[PDB]
Design a protein around this ligand. Structure first.
Ligand code: SF4
Ligand code: SF4
Ligand code: SF4
Ligand code: SF4
Ligand code: FES
Ligand code: ZN
Lengths: 28, 95, 108, 682, 114, 144, 100, 162, 68
């Protein structure tokens, strides 16, 4: 249980391979 | 008389015609002779003259709430066009 | 900060203030560095390796670069201009990343 | 052979060509394809590469086809073995000093050099000596240089001189060590700078934003149009998967010969940033994720309160014809006529098409003898249009400008900088007026700035006075043109997306404002207590001020209709799929119409196109520009009282484009445009 | 045998993202996407090989102009889950590091023939 | 087969080629061997989707399976065939795969379901889509 | 064994750079006018080589960036043309030159 | 434009000798055996324009070109990223068939194919390409014409000056 | 002629089951189970029109839905 892809549940920083940055609404 | 009342009655007026056709000759005479007087009587009313080579001549009036009545104006003399527009105004009064 | 910074190039094989050609990989995940996109560890990156290697002095205004010592066991032969080069601003082999500089243009 | 046509023999086959063609032109007419490197149809003939060599029976030695004039009874041989040997020798000379950079070259799959080496070259080399080495120099944020790969054609220099007109590039040096580029450290300043990359055959000039990201064979190309400005430049969007990788022009002699402006070319970067993916409904915690049903419910509860002209619609620069006709029908059904365009020319009359379109086609401006530019900087508004004005200036046309002194590429006569100068010119007191009257093909171009002026009625009346006095509109030639800076303006005028009589007569503080992609609205447009619905694809000033945000597709993600400044109807294609929970805009408006209780008749895209055809017949003729009946004089006779009502303003005719690289939400999101702006502002 | 990305003796990866190995792959087992690195080099941000789709033809080793991708001498690489058989750039680089000397010796022997 | 000078005793194969540009899309190709002449001959019959080709099984017994395969792959009906059935494709397959309009991956996919303890067919989904690489050059001349 | 100029591009130097200012002296300017008189007014760029020679003689034998910019301004041409002509010919020396 | 004078000769000759029997539009689509929802997809019949990077005319509709250049293409559908490996996933069966294999010599051939299968189609004509140089640089001689700055003024001549 | 081809193909479909080329699970999966599922299906009559439902469901209606 050493090597897994970066999209795996086991990966510390799991990757959603989205190629677009999404607008973050202003606070309040 | 009735030319003043287009603004009160119509929300918009569309004049579709063909740029060069025998059927649209009367519509072309109507637009190049009476459009200026109708605009002078109704300054703020949008009277849209839209043209295409294959376009079929028509006279459309939009009333309040999106009710649209289309009247074909093909092969009609410029005076007949004016009568048909008067009938459109009367129909708008009926609503 | 990196989310609104313009992607820039350090300038080893490029210029100090140019745009960096970037794809949209890692843009959703939030990664904005070249090495971060493909390496998830904290070890030394190959770019760190290549920076550690020092520029090599050569004689002449052109150096032939084969990448490796044997011509047929490395990069294609490349001819690099040594004009306007010094230790601080060396010329670079595009295939290998090796850095070169010469003093010959200064009539030496 | 009627008059001008002659006869030529190419490989023993009769071809009829005009007298003014060269050998290469006749060879193309004959179906024979000659190898070329330096010859370009739209650039000056050079003759340097010597790859076009063919055989003429009269001439002893091979001649260059591109620069050799064809003659009557000339026999042209393009397949003689001597020509094959000469081709191979020229190919060898081209490749001896070329760097072995094919794997690292971004021209790898699209290189003319490789393809003609394979087709018209030998398979092996005899060169063992040292190759030439060049040191690259910065030409700016958008152009990457590998001058070692440069075969010394002069396409970039010829473009920079004849077309771009910045005259920055030249061949410095003599012999083999001759080099191309600015002798000083200079950055290429033209907004047509990107075109040299396409003009470069051998990847010496390359696109820095599109560097090492993909290969040519990996990309799917979809032919669409550019909404960056109202020219509607025809483009090809290359995509890998769900990502747009690069944008390049297409050939359309009608509009963009083959040139694309830098903004249109490099704004795809801003299509990956600040994107709206999901419906957002405002709460005490701010805008938050919501489903389509919940957003529509909130819009229904908001519209229930508002009535009549309290409902207001503002359309943006990038809104398409179908979404605008959808919004128009929905708001007329609700009972509102407060339909405006964000520009600030909301009240511009849509009555006659000749008033707001370029009646002279873009192609026909080639034949202009004298051109007058009123209150327009055509460089910023449309760089390709300025390139065509440079082309007509080269022919010998005399150009006068009645706006502020601007750095147009060509030389021009500065008639004046304020409205009073145009008034004097229209009255007939001017040498340029006697030039306009004398000219057989006079053209008057009025900019969008005049349209966005508080005193537009009387300025337009003065322009019409000049039209009538100088006779620019006559039989067989209409010389009145209006240049637009936005794609959606002409379409909105055509459909009739104009405030109604009631809205103008009795202004009503809006209670609900619908933003159809409008991020450039003036702050007074929304009363600051109104309920704002923003429909769009980037998060910007519009989205920040929205109670409900409805995600929509972009021009790369939807099949939509746009009208040019000349009124030519052109259509986009879906290059990449829609992102997240976003939908096509007309579908959004029709779904909202069903939710609110005023269901719209159309339920399919062809039905929407039929509705557009009914409202304006030219929309059925996609790709064709329809002539306009000259009704402009009757309109101004109609609006006699209004033009008298219009007052005088203490403003001088000038462009409204502060910064060319950022003019819309997509450009503002783009990182590349920000770098260009920083480079210009230093 | 098992694939391995290689590094120069300095520690710089040999790959220059020409993408020929992905174009020549008969089985379409290689997916590559690249960028300009901060120094200015042409380097890959992604190099993954599907070893459940690979046919071990060796065409990718033939097409690479810089000897970056090689099929190493290791045939003991069975796994207990299919996810571990989808290699990526980091795994391929680790395999190249592990088998560097043997691969280098094999390449020195093979250079004589081709 | 039976002419004294030309004795093509053998049918090597029967094949069809789909040309969607043509009105008569399919070209049924027959390959023969004459052992006496040590020669090969190729016979082509150009048909469309609706027309049928008479079976030649009585002349060569080998034709039966070749015509069954041609019917399966391309959809060319062979008249008077003893029993025309599909050979290669899965049971219940209705499309003809070698037609140029048929998708390379097809329309359906096969999976075992745990809920219903059966192996079932479902509409196609691809984890990784087939990547078509367009390598054509403008300068090439051999393409007809 | 390369000659004086090894660069076909501008090499920034404390002597030769953008801030450096070059202008013709009044007598040299009269010589400039006499040189120009030989060529038609509209085709004024014909004097580029004689003017560059005159500026080289005045400036001590070096054709600097300021010299090229001044000649380009006087001839009303883009500076790249003067750069190209100053780089093409041999006698034009673009590096510091001795007394002899 | 003259003739290929190769296998294409026999190809065209086989084309002109033979012909197809007329059938009602859409009937063949039922014979094909594919899902009927395939024909709900919309068709675009177009010829690709020339790539701006290259100057070859092979891909264009030019007399030099002897290959089929009219494609049937279907509209683009949804695409997503594999959660594990970021690969581009799709559910469109007709994604690449039209681009890759559906090539036709003439627009009427593609229209006939679409009407035979029952696909609704829209034909897009390529923007016409005319190889006409502008009047300013119509020929090599025009580069060095008097058009650049006018005829040389002779008021600088010493005789005219004096 | 198209009718003839369709009839021949339908006869082939019948012959597959008749000659035991296809199996019991094939008959269950492809005919009996969907018909029984359709009989057992209870659905709420949607007040939203056909356009609204597809708009809520997905952006591209032409793409199929599984396990609806
Ligand atoms: S320009 Fe063409 S031949 Fe030269 S390195 Fe680039 S791809 Fe190779
Ligand atoms: S950079 Fe490109 S276009 Fe310019 S001269 Fe060199 S090869 Fe020609
Ligand atoms: S060995 Fe063959 S199948 Fe495997 S990755 Fe290399 S080229 Fe592809
Ligand atoms: S492994 Fe070799 S062939 Fe593959 S991308 Fe890297 S350098 Fe190119
Ligand atoms: S194309 Fe004619 S010499 Fe270059
Ligand atoms: Zn090297």
């Amino acid at each position: 249980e050493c090597y897994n892809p970066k999209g795996s549940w086991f990966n510390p920083a799991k990757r959603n391979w989205k190629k677009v940055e999404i607008w973050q609404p202003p606070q309040v | 008389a009735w030319k003043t009342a287009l603004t009160t009655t119509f929300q918009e007026l569309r004049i579709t015609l063909s740029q060069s056709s025998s059927s649209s000759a009367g519509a072309r005479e109507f637009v190049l002779g009476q459009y200026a007087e109708l605009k002078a009587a109704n300054p703020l009313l949008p009277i849209l003259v839209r043209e295409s080579n294959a376009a079929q001549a028509s006279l459309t009036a939009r009333y309040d709430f999106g009710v649209e009545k289309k009247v074909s104006i093909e092969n009609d003399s410029a005076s007949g066009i004016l009568s048909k527009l008067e009938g459109l105004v009367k129909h708008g009064q009926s609503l | 900060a990196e989310k609104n910074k313009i992607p820039e190039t350090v300038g080893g094989a490029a210029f100090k203030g140019d745009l960096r050609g970037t794809s949209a990989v890692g843009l959703g995940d939030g990664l904005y560095s070249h090495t971060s996109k493909w390496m998830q560890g904290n070890g030394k990156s190959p770019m760190d390796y290549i920076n550690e290697v020092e520029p090599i002095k050569v004689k002449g205004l052109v150096v032939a670069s084969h990448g490796s010592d044997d011509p047929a066991l490395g990069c294609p032969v490349e001819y690099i201009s040594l004009k306007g080069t010094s230790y601080e601003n060396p010329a670079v082999c595009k295939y290998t990343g090796n850095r070169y500089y010469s003093d010959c243009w200064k009539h030496g | 052979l009627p008059a001008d046509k002659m006869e030529v023999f190419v490989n023993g086959e009769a071809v009829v060509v005009p007298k003014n063609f060269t050998v290469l032109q006749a060879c193309d007419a004959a179906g024979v394809d000659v190898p070329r490197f330096c010859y370009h149809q739209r650039l000056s003939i050079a003759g340097n590469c010597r790859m076009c060599l063919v055989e003429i029976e009269k001439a002893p030695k091979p001649v260059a086809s591109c620069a050799f004039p064809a003659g009557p009874g000339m026999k042209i041989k393009t397949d003689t073995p001597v020509i094959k040997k000469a081709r191979e020798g020229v190919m060898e000379f081209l490749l001896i000093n070329h760097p072995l950079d094919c794997p690292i070259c971004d021209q790898g799959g699209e290189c003319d050099l490789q393809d003609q080496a394979m087709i018209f070259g030998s398979d092996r080399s005899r060169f063992i000596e040292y190759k030439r080495a060049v040191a690259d120099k910065n030409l700016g944020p958008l152009i990457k240089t590998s001058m070692n790969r440069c075969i010394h054609c002069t396409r970039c220099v010829r473009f920079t001189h004849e077309v771009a007109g910045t005259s920055e590039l030249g061949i410095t040096g003599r012999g083999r060590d001759s080099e191309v580029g600015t002798y000083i450290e200079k950055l290429h300043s033209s907004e047509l700078s990107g075109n040299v990359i396409d003009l470069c055959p051998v990847g010496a000039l390359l696109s820095k934003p599109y560097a090492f990201t993909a290969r040519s064979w990996e990309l799917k190309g979809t032919e669409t149009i550019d909404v960056s400005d109202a020219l509607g430049s025809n483009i090809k969007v290359d995509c890998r998967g769900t990502e747009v990788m690069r944008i390049t022009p297409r050939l359309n002699d009608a509009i963009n010969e083959e040139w694309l402006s830098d903004k249109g070319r490099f704004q795809y970067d801003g299509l990956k940033r600040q994107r709206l993916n999901t419906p957002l409904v405002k709460g005490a915690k701010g805008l938050e994720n919501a489903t389509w049903s919940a957003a529509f419910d909130a819009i229904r509860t908001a519209i229930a309160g508002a009535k009549g002209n309290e409902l207001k619609a503002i359309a943006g620069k990038l809104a398409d014809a179908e979404s605008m006709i959808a919004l128009k029908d929905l708001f007329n059904k609700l009972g509102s006529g407060n339909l405006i365009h964000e520009d600030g020319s909301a009240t511009l009359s849509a009555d006659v098409r000749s008033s707001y379109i370029a009646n002279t086609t873009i192609a026909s401006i080639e034949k202009a003898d004298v051109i007058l530019l009123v209150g327009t900087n055509p460089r910023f508004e449309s760089p390709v249009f300025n390139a065509r004005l440079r082309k007509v200036f080269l022919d010998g046309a005399k150009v006068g400008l009645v706006g502020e002194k601007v750095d147009l590429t060509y030389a021009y006569q500065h008639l004046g900088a304020d409205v009073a100068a145009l008034e004097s010119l229209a009255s007939g007191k001017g040498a340029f007026f006697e030039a306009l009257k004398g000219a057989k093909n006079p053209v008057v171009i009025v900019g969008s700035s005049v349209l966005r002026r508080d005193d537009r009625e009387a300025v337009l009346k003065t322009v019409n006075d000049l039209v009538d006095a100088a006779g620019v509109v006559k039989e067989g030639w209409n010389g009145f043109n209006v240049l637009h800076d936005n794609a959606s303006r002409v379409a909105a005028l055509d459909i009739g997306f104009v405030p109604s009589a009631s809205a103008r007569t009795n202004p009503v503080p809006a209670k609900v404002v619908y933003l159809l992609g409008s991020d450039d609205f003036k702050d007074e447009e929304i009363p600051a207590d109104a309920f704002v619905i923003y429909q769009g694809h980037h998060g910007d000033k519009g989205a920040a001020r929205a109670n409900v945000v409805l995600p929509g597709a972009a021009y790369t993600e939807k099949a939509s209709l746009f009208a040019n400044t000349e009124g030519r109807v052109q259509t986009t294609r879906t290059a990449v799929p829609v992102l997240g929970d976003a939908r096509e805009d007309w579908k959004i408006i029709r779904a909202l119409s069903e939710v609110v209780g005023q269901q719209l008749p159309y339920d399919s895209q062809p039905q929407v196109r039929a509705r557009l055809a009914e409202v304006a017949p030219h929309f059925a003729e996609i790709g064709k520009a329809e002539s306009a009946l000259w009704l402009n004089g009757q309109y101004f006779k109609g609006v006699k009282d209004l033009v008298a009502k219009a007052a005088r303003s203490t403003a001088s005719l000038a462009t409204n484009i502060s910064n060319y690289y950022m003019t819309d939400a997509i450009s503002r999101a783009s990182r590349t445009m920000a770098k260009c702006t920083a480079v210009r502002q230093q | 045998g098992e694939h391995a990305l290689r590094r120069y003796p300095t520690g710089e990866e040999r790959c220059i993202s020409c993408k020929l190995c992905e174009a020549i792959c008969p089985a379409q087992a290689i997916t590559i996407e690249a960028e300009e690195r901060e120094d200015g080099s042409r380097k890959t941000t992604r190099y993954d090989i599907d070893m459940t789709k690979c046919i071990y033809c060796g065409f990718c080793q033939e097409a690479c102009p810089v000897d970056a991708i090689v099929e190493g001498p290791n045939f003991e690489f069975s796994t207990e889950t299919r996810e571990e058989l989808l290699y990526d750039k980091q795994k391929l680089l680790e395999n190249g590091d592990k088998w560097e000397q043997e691969i280098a010796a094999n390449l020195r022997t093979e250079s004589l023939y081709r | 087969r039976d002419h004294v000078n030309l004795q093509y005793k053998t049918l090597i194969d029967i094949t069809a080629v789909d040309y969607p540009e043509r009105s008569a899309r399919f070209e049924v190709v027959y390959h023969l061997l004459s052992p006496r002449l040590n020669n090969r001959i190729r016979i082509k019959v150009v048909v469309d989707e609706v027309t049928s080709v008479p079976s030649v099984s009585r002349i060569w017994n080998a034709a039966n399976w070749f015509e069954r395969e041609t019917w399966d792959m391309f959809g060319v009906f062979f008249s008077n065939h003893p029993d025309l059935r599909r050979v290669l494709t899965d049971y219940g397959f209705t499309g003809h795969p070698l037609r140029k309009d048929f998708p390379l991956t097809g329309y359906t996919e096969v999976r075992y379901d745990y809920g219903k303890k059966r192996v079932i067919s479902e509409p196609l989904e691809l984890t990784q889509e087939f990547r078509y690489f367009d390598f054509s050059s403008p300068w090439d001349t051999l393409s007809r | 064994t390369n000659s004086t100029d090894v660069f076909n591009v501008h090499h920034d130097t404390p002597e030769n750079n953008k801030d450096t200012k070059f202008d013709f002296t009044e007598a040299n300017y009269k010589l400039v006018n006499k040189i120009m008189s030989n060529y038609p007014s509209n085709y004024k760029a014909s004097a580029m080589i004689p003017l560059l020679d005159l500026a080289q003689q005045q400036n001590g034998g070096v054709v600097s960036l300021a010299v090229m910019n001044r000649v380009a301004q006087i001839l009303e041409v883009p500076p790249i043309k003067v750069y190209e002509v100053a780089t093409f010919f041999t006698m034009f020396n673009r590096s510091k030159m001795g007394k002899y | 434009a003259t003739a290929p004078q190769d296998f294409s000769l026999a190809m065209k000759k086989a084309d002109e000798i033979y012909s197809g029997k007329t059938v009602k539009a859409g009937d063949i689509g039922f014979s094909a055996g594919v899902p009927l929802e395939t024909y709900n997809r919309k068709v675009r019949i177009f010829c690709p324009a020339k790539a701006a990077s290259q100057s070859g005319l092979g891909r264009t509709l030019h007399p030099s070109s002897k290959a089929p250049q009219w494609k049937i293409v279907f509209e683009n559908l949804s695409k997503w990223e594999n959660p594990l490996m970021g690969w581009t996933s799709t559910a469109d069966p007709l994604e690449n068939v039209g681009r890759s294999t559906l090539l036709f010599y003439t627009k009427e051939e593609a229209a006939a194919f679409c009407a035979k299968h029952g696909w609704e189609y829209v034909v897009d004509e390529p923007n016409p390409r005319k190889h006409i140089r502008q009047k300013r640089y119509l020929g090599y001689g025009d580069n060095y014409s008097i058009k650049r700055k006018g005829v040389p003024d002779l008021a600088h001549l010493p005789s005219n000056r004096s | 002629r198209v009718t003839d081809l369709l009839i021949f193909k339908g006869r082939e479909e019948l012959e597959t089951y008749l000659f035991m080329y296809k199996q019991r699970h094939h008959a269950i999966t492809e005919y009996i189970e969907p018909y029984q599922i359709k009989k057992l299906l209870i659905e709420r009559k949607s007040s939203n029109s056909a356009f609204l439902d597809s708009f809520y469901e997905k952006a591209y209606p032409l793409v199929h839905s599984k396990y609806a």
